[PDB]
Design a protein around this ligand. Sequence first.
Ligand SMILES: *[C@@H]1O[C@H](CO)[C@@H](O)[C@H](O)[C@H]1NC(C)=O
Ligand SMILES: *[C@@H]1O[C@H](CO)[C@@H](O)[C@H](O)[C@H]1NC(C)=O
Ligand SMILES: *[C@@H]1O[C@H](CO)[C@@H](O)[C@H](O)[C@H]1NC(C)=O
Ligand SMILES: *[C@@H]1O[C@H](CO)[C@@H](O)[C@H](O)[C@H]1NC(C)=O
Ligand SMILES: *[C@@H]1O[C@H](CO)[C@@H](O)[C@H](O)[C@H]1NC(C)=O
Ligand SMILES: *[C@@H]1O[C@H](CO)[C@@H](O)[C@H](O)[C@H]1NC(C)=O
Ligand SMILES: *[C@@H]1O[C@H](CO)[C@@H](O)[C@H](O)[C@H]1NC(C)=O
Ligand SMILES: *[C@@H]1O[C@H](CO)[C@@H](O)[C@H](O)[C@H]1NC(C)=O
Ligand SMILES: *[C@@H]1O[C@H](CO)[C@@H](O)[C@H](O)[C@H]1NC(C)=O
Ligand SMILES: *[C@@H]1O[C@H](CO)[C@@H](O)[C@H](O)[C@H]1NC(C)=O
Ligand SMILES: *[C@@H]1O[C@H](CO)[C@@H](O)[C@H](O)[C@H]1NC(C)=O
Lengths: 407, 234, 317, 147, 49
Amino acid sequence: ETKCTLKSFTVEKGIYQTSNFRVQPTESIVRFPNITNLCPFDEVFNATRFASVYAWNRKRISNCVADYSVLYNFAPFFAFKCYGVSPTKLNDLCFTNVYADSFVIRGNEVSQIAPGQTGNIADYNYKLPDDFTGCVIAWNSNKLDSKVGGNYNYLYRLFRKSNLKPFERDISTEIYQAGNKPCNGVAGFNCYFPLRSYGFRPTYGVGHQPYRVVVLSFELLHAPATVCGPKKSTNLVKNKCVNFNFNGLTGTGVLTESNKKFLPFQQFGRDIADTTDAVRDPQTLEILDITPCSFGGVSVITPGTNTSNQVAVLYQGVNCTEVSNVFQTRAGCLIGAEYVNNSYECDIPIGAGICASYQTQSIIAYTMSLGAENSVAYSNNSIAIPTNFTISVTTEILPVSMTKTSV
Amino acid sequence: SYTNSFTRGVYYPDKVFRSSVLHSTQDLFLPFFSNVTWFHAIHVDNPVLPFNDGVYFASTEKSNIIRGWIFGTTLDSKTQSLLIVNNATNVVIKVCEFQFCNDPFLDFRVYSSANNCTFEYVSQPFLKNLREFVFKNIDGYFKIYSKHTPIDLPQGFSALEPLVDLPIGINITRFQTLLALHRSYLTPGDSSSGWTAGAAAYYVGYLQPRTFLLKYNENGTITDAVDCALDPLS
Amino acid sequence: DCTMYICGDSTECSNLLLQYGSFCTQLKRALTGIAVEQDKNTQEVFAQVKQIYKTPPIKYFGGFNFSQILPDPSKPSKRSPIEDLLFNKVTLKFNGLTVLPPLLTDEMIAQYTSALLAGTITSGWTFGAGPALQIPFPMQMAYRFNGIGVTQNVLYENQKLIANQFNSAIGKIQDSLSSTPSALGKLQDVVNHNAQALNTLVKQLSSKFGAISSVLNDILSRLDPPEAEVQIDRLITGRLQSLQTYVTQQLIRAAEIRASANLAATKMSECVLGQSKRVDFCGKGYHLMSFPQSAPHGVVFLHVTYVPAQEKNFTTA
Amino acid sequence: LSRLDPPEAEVQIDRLITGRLQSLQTYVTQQLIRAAEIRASANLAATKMSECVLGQSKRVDFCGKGYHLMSFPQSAPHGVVFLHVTYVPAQEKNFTTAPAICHDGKAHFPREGVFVSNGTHWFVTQRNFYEPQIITTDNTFVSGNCD
Amino acid sequence: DCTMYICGDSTECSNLLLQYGSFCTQLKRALTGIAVEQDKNTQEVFAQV
Ligand SMILES: *[C@@H]1O[C@H](CO)[C@@H](O)[C@H](O)[C@H]1NC(C)=O
Ligand SMILES: *[C@@H]1O[C@H](CO)[C@@H](O)[C@H](O)[C@H]1NC(C)=O
Ligand SMILES: *[C@@H]1O[C@H](CO)[C@@H](O)[C@H](O)[C@H]1NC(C)=O
Ligand SMILES: *[C@@H]1O[C@H](CO)[C@@H](O)[C@H](O)[C@H]1NC(C)=O
Ligand SMILES: *[C@@H]1O[C@H](CO)[C@@H](O)[C@H](O)[C@H]1NC(C)=O
Ligand SMILES: *[C@@H]1O[C@H](CO)[C@@H](O)[C@H](O)[C@H]1NC(C)=O
Ligand SMILES: *[C@@H]1O[C@H](CO)[C@@H](O)[C@H](O)[C@H]1NC(C)=O
Ligand SMILES: *[C@@H]1O[C@H](CO)[C@@H](O)[C@H](O)[C@H]1NC(C)=O
Ligand SMILES: *[C@@H]1O[C@H](CO)[C@@H](O)[C@H](O)[C@H]1NC(C)=O
Ligand SMILES: *[C@@H]1O[C@H](CO)[C@@H](O)[C@H](O)[C@H]1NC(C)=O
Ligand SMILES: *[C@@H]1O[C@H](CO)[C@@H](O)[C@H](O)[C@H]1NC(C)=O
């Protein structure tokens, strides 16, 4: 690695920085807030009495967590056709409003509840938009909406001047002016009642029995979304740096408890450097400080391929209690060298007064010596007078000019 | 009347925590040492109070003489007007499409004739008795700050804690106070119902976009704030 | 860290960073050269002596008092009261920014300072030009007085007065240093500049630099692979332009520190290790001697100056 | 300029020019810093040449460690090597020293050197070479009594 | 002046410059330090007496 960093083959004697030691996270948490306003889906699907096809009952679903996975308590659906969306991706996309339109219809008329299709129901009673992005569910309701004599309470419109528009309702009961003869509120020739009734009976087959059909249409106006589906996992891992996603604050670090008492309205904390330092647990009220785990730099203290190949590693600025003689210094900690207790001349500097060299054998680590020891006898009646001279030569090399270059 | 709000009108700018540091933010704050309107002698006219940048509602009401507030567009027919009515143990926050009178009083339950409300938002009941409130509208969120501190406005320092947020976007340009007393006057037109009660004063002070430098202590409570376009030292 | 400062825990950002060029191996090559240079400036002034000298046990140099400059054996850290006062006045791994500790700690610099003090007190100036020669301190003071032109008789006769004046000056220098809190301004300015440049880099990371957000985990989760790239490219450009100027300012400050350290080493060699004939190079006035004192990021020279006073009018020919 | 068409190659050419200019600006800045360093080093070298080769200096470690005598310059492809001749004392010896000498009621101080003693004897010598000489009037001067 | 030199008269342009952060502060902090240093060099040579 030192040769790769230096881009050479014969590295000299010294300490060289090659890479950085990074602890990878093991697991990953996603602590988003506890679940609440399950939208009123059960009261629309498990209602007590459904409305007519022309008077299709509408509820607006807004400001509520939409668990679309409580659909699968109601039995095999003759149709769960989700148009424009997938039956699996619906519990993910947030939406502004979810309009639920329920109505009872025959078994042969359940197919008419879809975009584009025409017939006798979705022309004058309940027409769906062409570009309708939602989900139509339909299931039989014979056991509940069938009377022996006949349940003539469910009505449906058969005649109308012109077809309806997307999501339009008509509750008028005026006689159908079929011919030119202007009707006078009486029924008869060319003047028929528009609303007829269903003869729901238990003896009917499977195509004419009562079928309850609901339609959930999702709206995504520019308005902010208020109905968002559910989300959660559960680990408050400590003493280990993991990936946290606490109510949108995402990061990597050790989540350990603390005594940083926050105010009630606020969710996360920040130091001076604008970096995050603590965060609320969206479930139990307790403040945990975010602190990075072991992180620093590796340095190879190599004596050079000229002498040998035994090298030593130095992790700088990090305690190596976490991830070959281990010894902790004040500038880091070095593995591969032994701490010798005789101070010699510094050869390869490390930091905080520790140096390495080759004893000859293995890399050593010793406190650098500032020099020898000599204490002169200071006396008020003693002096040291020289006798001999020495003519020595001292070399002092100094650069003068540089390489004149142009671009 | 006209008085000065020396060192009041500060709140928490964002839901972030700090520990003994300084944070400078360009927000919509009340300018220090401004000229606010002390409406203490107006015992039910002039309800024309704008809502351009918000309102700083300060009061020293004795006990439950206020009944709530109303924030609307123009107080006309089919106009979104939010009414926050504070009862003894619950508050009601509904927006109505109704034409409100000059001074809708509460002692009554139905304010106008043709009321038509459409929202549903219930929360914890809100109502030396200083009750500081700061109202604003940004990002489609009708945002309020409330504080209950013992005392006019003193020279102390007290931040305004964000309590309740509610999503709505409208052209809020209305503001009026709803009082409470003994003599029942069902007449909406007659704006004269003065009763012998405690001292009533609804402070009105408009906010301004300014840069504020707040000091967060070790516990995360704003104890000092400086403005940056008044005094040269600031 | 060129990889972690620009690209936070993102492998695609790391793959995109290698296409910019060899800036990652040059910005870290210049900063380590700065560090190795800083590891040398602290050896040309304090490590001028070869053998460490010590103070004799008898604390009688002839009448003078050096208790405030000699190390105190009571305090576990072997330093002088002046060094202890100077150390208590200098007020001193975030996103890939580490602070490397110096080689010579505050204990080895103190030992070098004590050795230099012992050499300049007991031996005089011979400890910096060859073998150390013992000599009484009054005779060394007579030497230094004769070196500037003043005869040795004024010192050999009025020795008690000179000793009392030196003791009073040594005692008053502590109050003088404690009076003005901005006396150690040159040592605090460099520390403040360093902590400000180290803190201004984290403050600029929150800037979007043109992108929609500032964190990589948001751009790599809202936007799709090939429309996040021009954003990642702009973010890398902005984070590299903020680091290039930082490295340039660090190089300029390192050159300034190197020039200051060369000047300090020259002053230590020409004022502490001997007497100089320069006017205001070893103090304002007539220089006699100089005592060094260590400090967390510098050196304080105490220059002893002989100043004439109480002049009188006379006739000359 | 051969794969892409004129106006979609421009933002690419613009980005390439920006990248190649940002890599040259920092190079020029580093060159200026290194040139300032070289200029300071050359000024120091010229000062040393003028104060050590072209004469003798009284500075301690400006013309070599010790007592400077002379300096010889030598050229080098990108610098100058100064060979400083240093006189270093050695083979020192212990002796007895005294400030002055009281004789005839007068305190006499040495002119140059110090009063050395080696046992029941006193001589005068310089402070750099042991040369015992008898205490005479030529190398001594009276400056009062020995009180 | 970063605000007049880069963004002249243009409030919209200044609001983009603020998103670059502390660059403008570290520029004027150094340029005024240069002036303070130049106001000191004229006092170490001429103001010795
Ligand atoms: C979340 O639900 C768990 C289980 O009921 C409960 O113990 C915890 O207190 C809840 N947290 C909140 C937000 O109250
Ligand atoms: C390797 O050792 C040889 C022989 O002692 C010496 O000539 C040479 O300079 C050394 N090279 C390195 C890179 O240390
Ligand atoms: C490393 O951790 C151990 C155990 O907490 C501690 O005793 C030691 O002082 C630490 N070393 C340093 C200086 O980081
Ligand atoms: C070196 O000294 C340390 C600290 O006193 C001691 O713990 C250790 O045993 C010594 N090792 C050797 C090899 O003497
Ligand atoms: C040296 O000093 C000591 C302590 O004052 C004294 O007793 C001794 O006589 C002195 N010797 C001389 C005169 O050199
Ligand atoms: C407030 O403004 C009124 C006019 O609007 C003025 O008369 C009054 O003096 C001002 N009060 C202060 C001191 O701000
Ligand atoms: C309103 O206040 C009255 C009087 O205290 C109380 O009886 C009633 O229950 C309250 N209603 C609400 C909405 O809390
Ligand atoms: C030397 O200074 C110390 C500390 O101020 C003082 O305690 C002591 O009396 C002084 N001694 C002499 C001889 O002046
Ligand atoms: C010397 O005489 C001059 C002229 O009378 C006078 O100004 C000056 O102060 C005197 N100085 C001294 C030292 O007496
Ligand atoms: C002088 O005497 C002292 C004390 O015995 C001794 O330590 C020193 O080495 C001697 N020096 C010489 C030059 O003989
Ligand atoms: C000291 O040296 C001198 C000169 O050689 C000599 O005359 C004297 O006798 C010596 N003293 C002793 C006692 O050796």
